[PDB]
């Protein structure tokens, strides 16, 4: 019927034809993996923020039902006792009890895993759509960066740590907690990989703003390009010193900057997964120890990190059951 | 102007120079060069500075046992506060360096330089005959620079609170600022993070889409996202690229300007309570515990 | 012979790109390598 060389029609041909129809929404074969997984990830996060509690996992009341708003609501990670258990509804813990499974924090595992597979499905959707209209799948390759970030920080990082407890919970305030946790413990700002990632992200934002402004300002009055490449090139050559003489390479650079930044960030977070962190400069540490008068912004950063750690571990790590007396909590006036 | 048959005026406005000077460049080049030279000199070698008048000489010079990451130009001494501290007011050059005067020199010259840089951007927008709003877009990083270098000292009443001209100094300033003002929870910095993340997002999407389209676009993006793309025309897409990061950074700079005047981020401490009144912890108060640690460790006293 | 051989082309812009990348990585990572 239809095929390469007079191939008889099979069920697969009909399924492929239906899944690739130019309807309102392109489903595609990757749709079967994206839509269920992405839909269930979003639904799990919304349900967790609305109803499910974090009282029995993190000792927190983080949901709209308990009294938290959008900022403070989150799907808290499982307790450290669960370690790296995927926390299935049918697992050895919460053996089919949906209520307890929600109480165990398994809803975070549900959201995280279904979102990982939804991201895989969305990358496959990018590939499928690119092949559909015969374009290079550079958008899928670009999306490889956010997928790398997600796999590094939500999956690889907790896997390298003591459990899912230290993954970033799906929430605004919880993500801020995760960020400050990295600051206090890993000195993640000082990590060169994070430095490269932030440089890439800020450079990508700069490229976005500058390219938009220049394309909108070098527009032509009243199949052909709508803005003057020569004018933008001259403007940036005589303002900054360097300018893009090729539109292809310019747009590829806009693609490459954020992707590289996020990939280096992912590598750095992989390193942090094992506590392999560029926390300290040993030379400066010994210089400060031997010379009390010596002080820099790096030593002050180390002191602030110590303060964060000691003042936050009491509530951020209930499983450790840390009770720091007031006399041992680090303080600025105690230096 | 009008020097030797207006030859100086012709040369300043001349577009044949490899780098267009312009009348705004007449102020940018000296200001920016002075700031660059003083910053390089201070970073390479400068005596330790009492960032606060407690007489604790914080050191940020490379020669004083620092590296590029740790090295910084220390903010001006808290004793000086907002007072104008050029070289001629200090009793001696050593006293000027010991109180962090190079920081004010660099900050003032650099702020004037970036303002005149927006000016040069307008000048060469007009000279080349195009629409002059690259300066408007550049006003965002300039706005943030002013907020971190000028507006925050103004609100806090001391140049010691301005961002140190360093990397580790920048991280310390950010940690302190989160400690004192809860930057993460403020809606304007949240909007700025959204702006930067979306700027990277749209930069990546635009690069990928244009690279794939340049076989020698609209359908691909339409089928990809279910709501399709409103910016079907490239002009609207590029304006969106300009606007999103620009206004995001405008709003984060404004947020920092507001915190300069002691208008901190959202404070949801003890927002949710038990029936008996016992405080139930959330992520907000864990952030608060972190902020408490940063605050207590900051106050070296 | 070599029916399929192509000399590598590296224009001036790519040269400066590579040199800038190497020097930037060097300045960034020297502070950590020395430690």
């Amino acid at each position: 019927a239809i095929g390469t060389y007079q191939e008889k029609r099979t069920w697969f041909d009909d399924a492929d034809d239906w899944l690739r129809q130019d309807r309102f929404v392109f489903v595609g074969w990757s749709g079967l993996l994206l839509f269920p997984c992405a839909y269930f990830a979003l639904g799990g996060w919304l349900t967790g923020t609305t109803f499910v509690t974090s009282w029995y996992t993190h000792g927190l009341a983080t949901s709209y039902l308990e009294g938290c708003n959008f900022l403070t609501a989150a799907v808290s990670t499982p307790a450290n006792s669960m370690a790296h258990s995927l926390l299935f509804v049918w697992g050895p813990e919460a053996q089919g009890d949906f209520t307890r499974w929600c109480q165990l924090g398994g809803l975070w595992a549900f959201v995280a895993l279904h979102g990982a597979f939804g991201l895989i499905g969305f990358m496959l959707r990018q590939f499928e759509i690119a092949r559909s209209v015969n374009l290079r799948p550079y958008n899928a390759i670009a999306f490889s960066a956010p997928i790398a970030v997600f796999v590094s920080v939500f999956l690889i990082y907790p896997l390298g740590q003591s459990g899912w407890f230290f993954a970033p919970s799906f929430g605004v305030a919880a993500i801020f907690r995760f960020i400050l946790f990295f600051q206090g413990f890993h000195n993640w700002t000082l990590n060169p990989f994070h430095m490269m990632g932030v440089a890439g992200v800020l450079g990508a934002a700069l490229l976005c703003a500058i390219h938009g402004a220049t394309v909108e300002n070098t527009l032509f009055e009243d199949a052909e390009e709508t803005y003057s490449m020569v004018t933008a090139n001259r403007f940036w050559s005589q303002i900054f010193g360097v300018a893009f003489s090729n539109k292809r390479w310019l747009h590829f650079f806009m693609l490459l900057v954020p992707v590289t930044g996020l990939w280096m960030s992912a590598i750095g977070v992989v390193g942090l997964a094992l506590n392999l962190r560029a926390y300290d400069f040993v030379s400066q540490e010994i210089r400060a120890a031997e010379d009390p008068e010596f002080e820099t912004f790096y030593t002050k950063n180390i002191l602030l990190n110590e303060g964060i750690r000691a003042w936050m571990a009491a509530q951020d790590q209930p499983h450790e059951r840390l009770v720091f007396p007031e006399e041992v909590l680090p303080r600025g006036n105690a230096l | 102007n009008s020097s030797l048959w207006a030859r100086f005026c012709e040369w300043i406005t001349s577009t044949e120079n490899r780098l267009y000077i312009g009348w705004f460049g007449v102020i940018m080049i000296p200001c920016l060069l002075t700031a660059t030279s003083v910053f390089i000199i201070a970073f390479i070698a400068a005596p330790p500075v009492d960032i606060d008048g407690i007489r604790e000489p914080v050191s940020g010079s490379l020669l004083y046992g620092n590296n590029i990451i740790t090295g910084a130009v220390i903010p001006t001494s808290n004793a000086i506060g907002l007072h104008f501290y050029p070289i001629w007011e200090a009793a001696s050059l050593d006293e000027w360096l010991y109180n962090g005067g190079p920081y004010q020199l660099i900050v003032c010259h650099f702020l004037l330089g970036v303002y005149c840089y927006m000016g040069r951007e307008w000048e060469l927008s007009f000279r080349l005959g195009m629409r002059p709003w690259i300066a408007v877009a550049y006003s965002a990083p300039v706005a943030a620079a002013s907020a971190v270098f000028l507006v925050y000292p103004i609100g806090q009443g001391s140049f010691s609170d301005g961002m140190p001209l360093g990397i580790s100094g920048t991280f310390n300033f950010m940690i302190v600022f989160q400690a004192e003002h809860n930057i993460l929870m403020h809606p304007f910095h949240m909007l700025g993070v959204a702006g930067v993340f979306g700027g990277s997002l749209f930069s990546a999407m635009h690069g990928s889409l244009v690279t794939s389209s340049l076989i020698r676009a609209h359908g691909y993006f339409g089928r990809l996202i279910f709501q399709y793309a409103s910016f079907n025309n490239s002009r609207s897409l590029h304006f969106f690229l300009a606007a999103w990061p620009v206004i995001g950074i405008w709003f984060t700079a404004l947020g920092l300007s507001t915190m300069a005047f002691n208008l901190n981020g959202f404070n949801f401490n003890q927002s949710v309570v038990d029936s008996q009144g016992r405080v139930l912890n959330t992520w907000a108060d864990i952030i608060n515990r972190a902020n408490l640690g940063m605050e207590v460790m900051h106050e070296r006293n | 012979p070599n029916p399929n051989k192509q000399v590598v082309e590296l224009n001036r812009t790519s040269l400066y790109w590579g040199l800038l990348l190497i020097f930037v990585l060097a300045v960034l990572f020297s502070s950590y390598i020395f430690n």
């Binding site: 900054f240 010193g241 360097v242 | 490899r18 780098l19 390479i44 490379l62 020669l63 590296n67 590029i68 | 001036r12 400066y16 040199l19 800038l20 020097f23 930037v24 060097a26 300045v27 020297s30 502070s31 020395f34």
Partner: peptide
């Protein structure tokens, strides 16, 4: 020493900047 090598790397970066903007 350490400071001198840092300064050498920085001035080399500045020289690369100058060559790129001027020596096209």
């Amino acid at each position: 020493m350490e400071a001198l090598v840092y300064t050498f790397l920085l001035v080399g970066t500045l020289g690369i900047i100058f060559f790129s903007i001027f020596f096209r």
